[PDB]
């Protein structure tokens, strides 16, 4: 799809047997979700920083479907005000900026 | 231009008689720059919030050129770790997300 930016790019995502709303964020390096139980191993990871560090759970090679196309990448699970789809997953979807 | 997201989308911008590097951030509502003297009036504005509010100077109808095309919109001038081009300016450039 082509998405204009007059409003926030919230999309619907399928992940871990759940449906969630998330933000296509070209300004984020990583993908962060909250309130989900992902399969497989996880390692702790300190992210963020400015104001202090926040610990999350890093799951690797997690599938996320968005408007039809599927992406597989690392997902960080921890507290976040909005579910973020960072560039690590945007690139797996073939997402580009165009103007 | 078409910009892939394998790396951070830093571009070169012309604004206020200066050249600066900034980030095309679909995850930001507003455009924030630091260390510049913009012309015209400005009103104070509290932005951000999570962890506390930060005061910036809001200049309206400011021109910014990026890879050839010009945009006119509100620019917030205050401390920021990276110069951000929010959706208010991305939309003026005709910027979309495509995958």
Helix (H, G, I), strand (E, B) or coil at A5: coil
Nearest to B26 among A24, A69, A93 (CB): A24
Strands B69-77 and B52-66: antiparallel
- The residue whose two tokens read 């951070």 is B8
Nearest to A29 by CA among B5, B48, B31, B96: B5
Give me the sign of the Cα torsion angle B48, B83, A4, B38: positive
Does A29 sit within 8 Å of B27, measured CB to CB? no
Q: B71: which 2 tokens?
A: 């945009």
- Is residue B98 within 8 A of residue A99, CB to CB? The reply is no
- Is residue B59 within 8 A of residue B38, CB to CB? The reply is yes
The H-assigned helical ranges of B1-99 are 87-90
Q: B17: which 2 tokens?
A: 């008689």
Helix (H, G, I), strand (E, B) or coil at A83: coil
Does B5 sit within 8 Å of A26, measured CB to CB? yes
State the Cα–Cα distance between residues B69 and A48, nearest whole angstrom.
33
Q: Which helix (H) or strand (E) holds A89?
A: helix A87-90
Direct distance between the N- and C-terminal alpha carbons of chain A, in angstroms, rounded to an integer:
15
State the Cα–Cα distance between residues A25 and B84, nearest whole angstrom.
13
Resolution of this deposited model, Å: 2.4
Domain ranges of chain A: 1-99
State the Cα–Cα distance between residues A40 and B35, nearest whole angstrom.
46
Interface contact B48, partner A, CB < 8 A: no
């Amino acid at each position: 799809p082509q998405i204009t930016l007059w409003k926030r790019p919230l999309v619907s995502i399928k992940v871990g047997g759940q449906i969630k709303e998330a933000l296509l964020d070209t300004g984020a390096d990583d993908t962060v979700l909250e309130e989900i139980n992902l399969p497989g191993k996880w390692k702790p990871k300190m992210i963020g920083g400015i104001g202090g560090f926040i610990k999350v759970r890093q799951y690797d090679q997690i599938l996320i479907e968005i408007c039809g196309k599927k992406a597989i990448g690392t997902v960080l699970v921890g507290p976040t005000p909005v579910n973020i789809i960072g560039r690590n997953m945007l690139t797996q979807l073939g997402c580009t900026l165009n103007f």
